[PDB]
Amino acid sequence: SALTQPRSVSGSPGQSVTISCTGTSSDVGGYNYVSWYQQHPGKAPKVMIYDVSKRPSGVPDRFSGSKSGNTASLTISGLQAEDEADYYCCSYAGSYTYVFGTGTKVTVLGQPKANPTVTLFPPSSEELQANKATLVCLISDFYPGAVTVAWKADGSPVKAGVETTKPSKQSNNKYAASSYLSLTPEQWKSHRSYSCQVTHEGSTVEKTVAP
Amino acid sequence: VQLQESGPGLVKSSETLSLTCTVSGGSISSYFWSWIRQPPGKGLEWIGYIYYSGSTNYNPSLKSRVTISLHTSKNQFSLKLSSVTAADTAVYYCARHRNWLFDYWGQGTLVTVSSASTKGPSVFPLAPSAALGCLVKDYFPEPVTVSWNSGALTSGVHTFPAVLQSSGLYSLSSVVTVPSSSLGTQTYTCNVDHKPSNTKVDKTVE
């Protein structure tokens, strides 16, 4: 089980952010072998913190690390543009094994927050005639560039046949994401409704379709 | 220390994935040498590592399918992942492991798992009921380009990155937001170009 981090954190230049990393007594709580890695797009991850709170040479002291029980925390004071990246925690997990966290995007706020436009398209009759059924949830004009998408069938969770893209920057500098629920025409017909539920900055936007 | 992954790029489903990492600036006769991956989908996933002695330890969920070996005559170490499926498409990273951390990483290399051969897309309409679009479904390999009205329509367009489906085929979509009252007066056409299969499609939506 990957270590649990939040999906997104954000703050303005000069300000602070904290990223949690929740494991168990077998990993984060069991040892002081917790490290954190910074990853820019297409670059090698870089160690920023190791053994919970220790900084490699060259890493600024604005990066600090702590731990309480089963949760480790990385704090980035005095945010600068270059701190915008994905961050992963990692722990020793016993018997010569390691487990990484799920990743957090840190955004350094340079434009206004914005909640997503969400459009859910049912499968076309043309696709249905081709004996396939694809629900298409398109998500645009959001900032910061991180979103959680949950699919529902008759209100209950679906996680078979789901594929979601990582947010992409648009020409207007906001972000876009897409999600797909792929199924058969009978499976499409086997529920009264389907919904795409998009969570952004503590707000949900839900669209529903029916055959 | 610099690390460089090398590899096949594309692997057919149910084949063995083999990757090599060549190390420069130091010897693989010290420390541990590891592989980690990232599905376009999730965060990092530790695969395993090899100690300079040849001793290995693997992620319990991958262990039955994984071998990591040393090739000291070339300062290299390798990964073999057996019988890959769609769930193994990822960027694979090699890294040095030392003192309870991963101190030097390669930049990573994308391995795509698909047994597909070249196939042009089916383009389906995403009709309005104002936003509308085109679903460019089931093509291989990348890439596809999408324009609207042959380039003349741009405001409110976004064409999303492709997903690779468990079929081993890609899909993407493109959406445009238009004024509600334009639907009767004006046609909206997505122009889909898939160079690899020599396929261009023009689909006019509702």
Residue numbers in the entry:
A (entry chain B): 2 to 9, 11 to 30, 30A, 30B, 30C, 31 to 95, 95A, 96 to 209
B (entry chain A): 2 to 82, 82A, 82B, 82C, 83 to 127, 136 to 212
What did the published study say regarding this structure?
Among various ANAs, anti-double-stranded DNA (dsDNA) antibodies are a reliable diagnostic marker for SLE. It should be noted that 71F12 has base specificity, as this clone exclusively bound to the thymine-containing ssDNA and dsDNA.
In the anti-DNA 71F12 lineage, a majority of the diverse sequences shared three amino acid mutations, one in HCDR1 (Y33F) and two in the framework regions (P14S and D72H). Therefore, both Y33F and D72H somatic mutations contribute significantly to the acquisition of high affinity toward a stretch of DNA containing at least one thymine.
